[PDB]
Amino acid sequence: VNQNAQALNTLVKQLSSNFGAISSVLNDILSRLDPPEAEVQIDRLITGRL
Amino acid sequence: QIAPGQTGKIADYNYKLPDDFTGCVIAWNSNNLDSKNYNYLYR
């Protein structure tokens, strides 16, 4: 029960990580940057998240 | 501004390329022909 709950928490906590992007929030990146830049910042978050 | 994904008066109101345009942009100084001149409209 502990290990399954630690893996679930660790998977959710990894959403708040940067992976070399400018924020761990997606709407920040979408609003603060234009698509030629924002689509690299989200290639970062996807290649981290996946 | 004549490049993919750009910003400024041209790329926002006049001539906009996709963020993934496939092709080449080629340009030359034409002060030898086109200047006198106020015919060249933009928004």
mmCIF file with all atom_site columns, N, CA and C in Angstrom, chain A:
data_model
loop_
_atom_site.group_PDB
_atom_site.id
_atom_site.type_symbol
_atom_site.label_atom_id
_atom_site.label_alt_id
_atom_site.label_comp_id
_atom_site.label_asym_id
_atom_site.label_entity_id
_atom_site.label_seq_id
_atom_site.pdbx_PDB_ins_code
_atom_site.Cartn_x
_atom_site.Cartn_y
_atom_site.Cartn_z
_atom_site.occupancy
_atom_site.B_iso_or_equiv
_atom_site.pdbx_formal_charge
_atom_site.auth_seq_id
_atom_site.auth_comp_id
_atom_site.auth_asym_id
_atom_site.auth_atom_id
_atom_site.pdbx_PDB_model_num
ATOM 1   N N  . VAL A 1 1  ? 0.833  -1.198 0.000   1.00 0.00 ? 1  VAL A N  1
ATOM 2   C CA . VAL A 1 1  ? 0.000  0.000  0.000   1.00 0.00 ? 1  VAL A CA 1
ATOM 3   C C  . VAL A 1 1  ? 0.871  1.253  0.000   1.00 0.00 ? 1  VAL A C  1
ATOM 4   N N  . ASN A 1 2  ? 1.951  1.277  0.789   1.00 0.00 ? 2  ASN A N  1
ATOM 5   C CA . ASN A 1 2  ? 2.908  2.385  0.807   1.00 0.00 ? 2  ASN A CA 1
ATOM 6   C C  . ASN A 1 2  ? 3.600  2.581  -0.540  1.00 0.00 ? 2  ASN A C  1
ATOM 7   N N  . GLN A 1 3  ? 4.126  1.534  -1.177  1.00 0.00 ? 3  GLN A N  1
ATOM 8   C CA . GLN A 1 3  ? 4.890  1.705  -2.408  1.00 0.00 ? 3  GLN A CA 1
ATOM 9   C C  . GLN A 1 3  ? 4.012  2.186  -3.554  1.00 0.00 ? 3  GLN A C  1
ATOM 10  N N  . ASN A 1 4  ? 2.796  1.656  -3.659  1.00 0.00 ? 4  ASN A N  1
ATOM 11  C CA . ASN A 1 4  ? 1.837  2.111  -4.659  1.00 0.00 ? 4  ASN A CA 1
ATOM 12  C C  . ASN A 1 4  ? 1.462  3.583  -4.427  1.00 0.00 ? 4  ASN A C  1
ATOM 13  N N  . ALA A 1 5  ? 1.247  3.996  -3.176  1.00 0.00 ? 5  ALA A N  1
ATOM 14  C CA . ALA A 1 5  ? 0.957  5.386  -2.846  1.00 0.00 ? 5  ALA A CA 1
ATOM 15  C C  . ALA A 1 5  ? 2.152  6.340  -3.005  1.00 0.00 ? 5  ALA A C  1
ATOM 16  N N  . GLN A 1 6  ? 3.385  5.888  -2.768  1.00 0.00 ? 6  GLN A N  1
ATOM 17  C CA . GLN A 1 6  ? 4.614  6.631  -3.073  1.00 0.00 ? 6  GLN A CA 1
ATOM 18  C C  . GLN A 1 6  ? 4.840  6.800  -4.576  1.00 0.00 ? 6  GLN A C  1
ATOM 19  N N  . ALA A 1 7  ? 4.534  5.795  -5.388  1.00 0.00 ? 7  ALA A N  1
ATOM 20  C CA . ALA A 1 7  ? 4.657  5.910  -6.834  1.00 0.00 ? 7  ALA A CA 1
ATOM 21  C C  . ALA A 1 7  ? 3.618  6.870  -7.406  1.00 0.00 ? 7  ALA A C  1
ATOM 22  N N  . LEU A 1 8  ? 2.378  6.815  -6.919  1.00 0.00 ? 8  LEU A N  1
ATOM 23  C CA . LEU A 1 8  ? 1.352  7.785  -7.295  1.00 0.00 ? 8  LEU A CA 1
ATOM 24  C C  . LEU A 1 8  ? 1.739  9.214  -6.903  1.00 0.00 ? 8  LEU A C  1
ATOM 25  N N  . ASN A 1 9  ? 2.152  9.474  -5.660  1.00 0.00 ? 9  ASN A N  1
ATOM 26  C CA . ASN A 1 9  ? 2.605  10.811 -5.289  1.00 0.00 ? 9  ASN A CA 1
ATOM 27  C C  . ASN A 1 9  ? 3.783  11.243 -6.147  1.00 0.00 ? 9  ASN A C  1
ATOM 28  N N  . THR A 1 10 ? 4.805  10.409 -6.342  1.00 0.00 ? 10 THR A N  1
ATOM 29  C CA . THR A 1 10 ? 5.988  10.810 -7.121  1.00 0.00 ? 10 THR A CA 1
ATOM 30  C C  . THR A 1 10 ? 5.623  11.145 -8.563  1.00 0.00 ? 10 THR A C  1
ATOM 31  N N  . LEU A 1 11 ? 4.693  10.408 -9.170  1.00 0.00 ? 11 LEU A N  1
ATOM 32  C CA . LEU A 1 11 ? 4.227  10.695 -10.518 1.00 0.00 ? 11 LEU A CA 1
ATOM 33  C C  . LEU A 1 11 ? 3.504  12.044 -10.597 1.00 0.00 ? 11 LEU A C  1
ATOM 34  N N  . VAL A 1 12 ? 2.684  12.390 -9.607  1.00 0.00 ? 12 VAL A N  1
ATOM 35  C CA . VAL A 1 12 ? 1.982  13.675 -9.581  1.00 0.00 ? 12 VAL A CA 1
ATOM 36  C C  . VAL A 1 12 ? 2.938  14.825 -9.297  1.00 0.00 ? 12 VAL A C  1
ATOM 37  N N  . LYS A 1 13 ? 3.856  14.676 -8.339  1.00 0.00 ? 13 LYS A N  1
ATOM 38  C CA . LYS A 1 13 ? 4.858  15.701 -8.011  1.00 0.00 ? 13 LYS A CA 1
ATOM 39  C C  . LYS A 1 13 ? 5.729  16.054 -9.208  1.00 0.00 ? 13 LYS A C  1
ATOM 40  N N  . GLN A 1 14 ? 6.052  15.095 -10.071 1.00 0.00 ? 14 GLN A N  1
ATOM 41  C CA . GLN A 1 14 ? 6.798  15.346 -11.304 1.00 0.00 ? 14 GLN A CA 1
ATOM 42  C C  . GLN A 1 14 ? 6.092  16.287 -12.296 1.00 0.00 ? 14 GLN A C  1
ATOM 43  N N  . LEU A 1 15 ? 4.808  16.628 -12.132 1.00 0.00 ? 15 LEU A N  1
ATOM 44  C CA . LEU A 1 15 ? 4.175  17.700 -12.915 1.00 0.00 ? 15 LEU A CA 1
ATOM 45  C C  . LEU A 1 15 ? 4.702  19.097 -12.581 1.00 0.00 ? 15 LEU A C  1
ATOM 46  N N  . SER A 1 16 ? 5.155  19.317 -11.349 1.00 0.00 ? 16 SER A N  1
ATOM 47  C CA . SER A 1 16 ? 5.647  20.615 -10.881 1.00 0.00 ? 16 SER A CA 1
ATOM 48  C C  . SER A 1 16 ? 7.136  20.859 -11.190 1.00 0.00 ? 16 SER A C  1
ATOM 49  N N  . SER A 1 17 ? 7.825  19.883 -11.792 1.00 0.00 ? 17 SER A N  1
ATOM 50  C CA . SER A 1 17 ? 9.223  19.956 -12.253 1.00 0.00 ? 17 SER A CA 1
ATOM 51  C C  . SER A 1 17 ? 9.373  20.699 -13.591 1.00 0.00 ? 17 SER A C  1
ATOM 52  N N  . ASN A 1 18 ? 10.533 21.313 -13.837 1.00 0.00 ? 18 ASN A N  1
ATOM 53  C CA . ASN A 1 18 ? 10.771 22.161 -15.012 1.00 0.00 ? 18 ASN A CA 1
ATOM 54  C C  . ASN A 1 18 ? 11.337 21.417 -16.230 1.00 0.00 ? 18 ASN A C  1
ATOM 55  N N  . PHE A 1 19 ? 12.173 20.392 -16.063 1.00 0.00 ? 19 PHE A N  1
ATOM 56  C CA . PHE A 1 19 ? 12.841 19.662 -17.156 1.00 0.00 ? 19 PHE A CA 1
ATOM 57  C C  . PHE A 1 19 ? 13.643 20.542 -18.146 1.00 0.00 ? 19 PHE A C  1
ATOM 58  N N  . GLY A 1 20 ? 14.071 21.739 -17.737 1.00 0.00 ? 20 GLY A N  1
ATOM 59  C CA . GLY A 1 20 ? 14.705 22.732 -18.616 1.00 0.00 ? 20 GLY A CA 1
ATOM 60  C C  . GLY A 1 20 ? 13.743 23.715 -19.302 1.00 0.00 ? 20 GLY A C  1
ATOM 61  N N  . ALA A 1 21 ? 12.443 23.676 -19.010 1.00 0.00 ? 21 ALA A N  1
ATOM 62  C CA . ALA A 1 21 ? 11.471 24.687 -19.431 1.00 0.00 ? 21 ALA A CA 1
ATOM 63  C C  . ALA A 1 21 ? 11.349 25.857 -18.428 1.00 0.00 ? 21 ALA A C  1
ATOM 64  N N  . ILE A 1 22 ? 10.773 26.981 -18.858 1.00 0.00 ? 22 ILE A N  1
ATOM 65  C CA . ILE A 1 22 ? 10.648 28.221 -18.063 1.00 0.00 ? 22 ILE A CA 1
ATOM 66  C C  . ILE A 1 22 ? 9.568  28.207 -16.965 1.00 0.00 ? 22 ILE A C  1
ATOM 67  N N  . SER A 1 23 ? 8.632  27.261 -16.993 1.00 0.00 ? 23 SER A N  1
ATOM 68  C CA . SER A 1 23 ? 7.673  27.010 -15.909 1.00 0.00 ? 23 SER A CA 1
ATOM 69  C C  . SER A 1 23 ? 7.234  25.551 -15.963 1.00 0.00 ? 23 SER A C  1
ATOM 70  N N  . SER A 1 24 ? 6.773  25.010 -14.844 1.00 0.00 ? 24 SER A N  1
ATOM 71  C CA . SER A 1 24 ? 6.098  23.713 -14.779 1.00 0.00 ? 24 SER A CA 1
ATOM 72  C C  . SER A 1 24 ? 4.585  23.816 -15.000 1.00 0.00 ? 24 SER A C  1
ATOM 73  N N  . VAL A 1 25 ? 4.069  25.022 -15.228 1.00 0.00 ? 25 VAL A N  1
ATOM 74  C CA . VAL A 1 25 ? 2.668  25.268 -15.556 1.00 0.00 ? 25 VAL A CA 1
ATOM 75  C C  . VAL A 1 25 ? 2.540  25.456 -17.055 1.00 0.00 ? 25 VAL A C  1
ATOM 76  N N  . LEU A 1 26 ? 1.547  24.819 -17.665 1.00 0.00 ? 26 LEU A N  1
ATOM 77  C CA . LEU A 1 26 ? 1.406  24.835 -19.114 1.00 0.00 ? 26 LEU A CA 1
ATOM 78  C C  . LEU A 1 26 ? 0.817  26.160 -19.629 1.00 0.00 ? 26 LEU A C  1
ATOM 79  N N  . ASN A 1 27 ? -0.211 26.710 -18.977 1.00 0.00 ? 27 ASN A N  1
ATOM 80  C CA . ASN A 1 27 ? -0.817 27.978 -19.405 1.00 0.00 ? 27 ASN A CA 1
ATOM 81  C C  . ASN A 1 27 ? 0.127  29.186 -19.281 1.00 0.00 ? 27 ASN A C  1
ATOM 82  N N  . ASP A 1 28 ? 1.061  29.186 -18.327 1.00 0.00 ? 28 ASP A N  1
ATOM 83  C CA . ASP A 1 28 ? 2.162  30.149 -18.310 1.00 0.00 ? 28 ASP A CA 1
ATOM 84  C C  . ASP A 1 28 ? 2.865  30.147 -19.656 1.00 0.00 ? 28 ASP A C  1
ATOM 85  N N  . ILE A 1 29 ? 3.360  28.992 -20.093 1.00 0.00 ? 29 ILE A N  1
ATOM 86  C CA . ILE A 1 29 ? 4.141  28.892 -21.321 1.00 0.00 ? 29 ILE A CA 1
ATOM 87  C C  . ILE A 1 29 ? 3.304  29.304 -22.529 1.00 0.00 ? 29 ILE A C  1
ATOM 88  N N  . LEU A 1 30 ? 2.030  28.914 -22.570 1.00 0.00 ? 30 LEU A N  1
ATOM 89  C CA . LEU A 1 30 ? 1.137  29.233 -23.683 1.00 0.00 ? 30 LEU A CA 1
ATOM 90  C C  . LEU A 1 30 ? 0.838  30.731 -23.782 1.00 0.00 ? 30 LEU A C  1
ATOM 91  N N  . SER A 1 31 ? 0.689  31.412 -22.644 1.00 0.00 ? 31 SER A N  1
ATOM 92  C CA . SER A 1 31 ? 0.331  32.837 -22.584 1.00 0.00 ? 31 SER A CA 1
ATOM 93  C C  . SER A 1 31 ? 1.541  33.778 -22.656 1.00 0.00 ? 31 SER A C  1
ATOM 94  N N  . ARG A 1 32 ? 2.611  33.474 -21.926 1.00 0.00 ? 32 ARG A N  1
ATOM 95  C CA . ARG A 1 32 ? 3.797  34.346 -21.888 1.00 0.00 ? 32 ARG A CA 1
ATOM 96  C C  . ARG A 1 32 ? 4.744  34.336 -23.101 1.00 0.00 ? 32 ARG A C  1
ATOM 97  N N  . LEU A 1 33 ? 4.620  33.330 -23.959 1.00 0.00 ? 33 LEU A N  1
ATOM 98  C CA . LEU A 1 33 ? 5.476  33.182 -25.146 1.00 0.00 ? 33 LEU A CA 1
ATOM 99  C C  . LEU A 1 33 ? 4.681  32.989 -26.451 1.00 0.00 ? 33 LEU A C  1
ATOM 100 N N  . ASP A 1 34 ? 5.288  33.351 -27.584 1.00 0.00 ? 34 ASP A N  1
ATOM 101 C CA . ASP A 1 34 ? 4.748  33.053 -28.919 1.00 0.00 ? 34 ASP A CA 1
ATOM 102 C C  . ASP A 1 34 ? 5.081  31.621 -29.391 1.00 0.00 ? 34 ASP A C  1
ATOM 103 N N  . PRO A 1 35 ? 4.218  30.992 -30.216 1.00 0.00 ? 35 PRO A N  1
ATOM 104 C CA . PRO A 1 35 ? 4.345  29.599 -30.653 1.00 0.00 ? 35 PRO A CA 1
ATOM 105 C C  . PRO A 1 35 ? 5.726  29.101 -31.115 1.00 0.00 ? 35 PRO A C  1
ATOM 106 N N  . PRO A 1 36 ? 6.548  29.840 -31.888 1.00 0.00 ? 36 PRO A N  1
ATOM 107 C CA . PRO A 1 36 ? 7.877  29.356 -32.275 1.00 0.00 ? 36 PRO A CA 1
ATOM 108 C C  . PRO A 1 36 ? 8.795  29.057 -31.083 1.00 0.00 ? 36 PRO A C  1
ATOM 109 N N  . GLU A 1 37 ? 8.571  29.731 -29.953 1.00 0.00 ? 37 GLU A N  1
ATOM 110 C CA . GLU A 1 37 ? 9.309  29.566 -28.697 1.00 0.00 ? 37 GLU A CA 1
ATOM 111 C C  . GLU A 1 37 ? 8.566  28.628 -27.733 1.00 0.00 ? 37 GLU A C  1
ATOM 112 N N  . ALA A 1 38 ? 7.265  28.868 -27.539 1.00 0.00 ? 38 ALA A N  1
ATOM 113 C CA . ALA A 1 38 ? 6.425  28.080 -26.645 1.00 0.00 ? 38 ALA A CA 1
ATOM 114 C C  . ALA A 1 38 ? 6.392  26.601 -27.051 1.00 0.00 ? 38 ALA A C  1
ATOM 115 N N  . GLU A 1 39 ? 6.387  26.297 -28.348 1.00 0.00 ? 39 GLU A N  1
ATOM 116 C CA . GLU A 1 39 ? 6.439  24.913 -28.816 1.00 0.00 ? 39 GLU A CA 1
ATOM 117 C C  . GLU A 1 39 ? 7.796  24.222 -28.607 1.00 0.00 ? 39 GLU A C  1
ATOM 118 N N  . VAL A 1 40 ? 8.885  24.941 -28.322 1.00 0.00 ? 40 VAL A N  1
ATOM 119 C CA . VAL A 1 40 ? 10.129 24.325 -27.825 1.00 0.00 ? 40 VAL A CA 1
ATOM 120 C C  . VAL A 1 40 ? 10.043 24.114 -26.319 1.00 0.00 ? 40 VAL A C  1
ATOM 121 N N  . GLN A 1 41 ? 9.549  25.111 -25.581 1.00 0.00 ? 41 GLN A N  1
ATOM 122 C CA . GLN A 1 41 ? 9.356  24.983 -24.134 1.00 0.00 ? 41 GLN A CA 1
ATOM 123 C C  . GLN A 1 41 ? 8.432  23.813 -23.771 1.00 0.00 ? 41 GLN A C  1
ATOM 124 N N  . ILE A 1 42 ? 7.452  23.499 -24.617 1.00 0.00 ? 42 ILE A N  1
ATOM 125 C CA . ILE A 1 42 ? 6.580  22.338 -24.437 1.00 0.00 ? 42 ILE A CA 1
ATOM 126 C C  . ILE A 1 42 ? 7.177  21.051 -25.031 1.00 0.00 ? 42 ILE A C  1
ATOM 127 N N  . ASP A 1 43 ? 8.087  21.081 -26.007 1.00 0.00 ? 43 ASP A N  1
ATOM 128 C CA . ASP A 1 43 ? 8.876  19.875 -26.321 1.00 0.00 ? 43 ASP A CA 1
ATOM 129 C C  . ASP A 1 43 ? 9.741  19.462 -25.129 1.00 0.00 ? 43 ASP A C  1
ATOM 130 N N  . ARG A 1 44 ? 10.114 20.434 -24.301 1.00 0.00 ? 44 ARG A N  1
ATOM 131 C CA . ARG A 1 44 ? 10.878 20.167 -23.091 1.00 0.00 ? 44 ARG A CA 1
ATOM 132 C C  . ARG A 1 44 ? 9.963  19.454 -22.090 1.00 0.00 ? 44 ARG A C  1
ATOM 133 N N  . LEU A 1 45 ? 8.859  20.104 -21.716 1.00 0.00 ? 45 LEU A N  1
ATOM 134 C CA . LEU A 1 45 ? 7.897  19.507 -20.788 1.00 0.00 ? 45 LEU A CA 1
ATOM 135 C C  . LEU A 1 45 ? 7.364  18.155 -21.266 1.00 0.00 ? 45 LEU A C  1
ATOM 136 N N  . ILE A 1 46 ? 7.129  17.934 -22.558 1.00 0.00 ? 46 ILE A N  1
ATOM 137 C CA . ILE A 1 46 ? 6.659  16.629 -23.028 1.00 0.00 ? 46 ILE A CA 1
ATOM 138 C C  . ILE A 1 46 ? 7.777  15.603 -22.918 1.00 0.00 ? 46 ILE A C  1
ATOM 139 N N  . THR A 1 47 ? 8.987  15.895 -23.393 1.00 0.00 ? 47 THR A N  1
ATOM 140 C CA . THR A 1 47 ? 10.079 14.906 -23.335 1.00 0.00 ? 47 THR A CA 1
ATOM 141 C C  . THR A 1 47 ? 10.496 14.596 -21.895 1.00 0.00 ? 47 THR A C  1
ATOM 142 N N  . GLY A 1 48 ? 10.221 15.489 -20.947 1.00 0.00 ? 48 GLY A N  1
ATOM 143 C CA . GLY A 1 48 ? 10.259 15.188 -19.518 1.00 0.00 ? 48 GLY A CA 1
ATOM 144 C C  . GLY A 1 48 ? 9.070  14.351 -19.036 1.00 0.00 ? 48 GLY A C  1
ATOM 145 N N  . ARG A 1 49 ? 7.860  14.871 -19.205 1.00 0.00 ? 49 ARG A N  1
ATOM 146 C CA . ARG A 1 49 ? 6.652  14.190 -18.738 1.00 0.00 ? 49 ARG A CA 1
ATOM 147 C C  . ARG A 1 49 ? 6.464  12.757 -19.241 1.00 0.00 ? 49 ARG A C  1
ATOM 148 N N  . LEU A 1 50 ? 6.688  12.552 -20.533 1.00 0.00 ? 50 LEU A N  1
ATOM 149 C CA . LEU A 1 50 ? 6.510  11.245 -21.155 1.00 0.00 ? 50 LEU A CA 1
ATOM 150 C C  . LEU A 1 50 ? 7.514  10.220 -20.617 1.00 0.00 ? 50 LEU A C  1
#
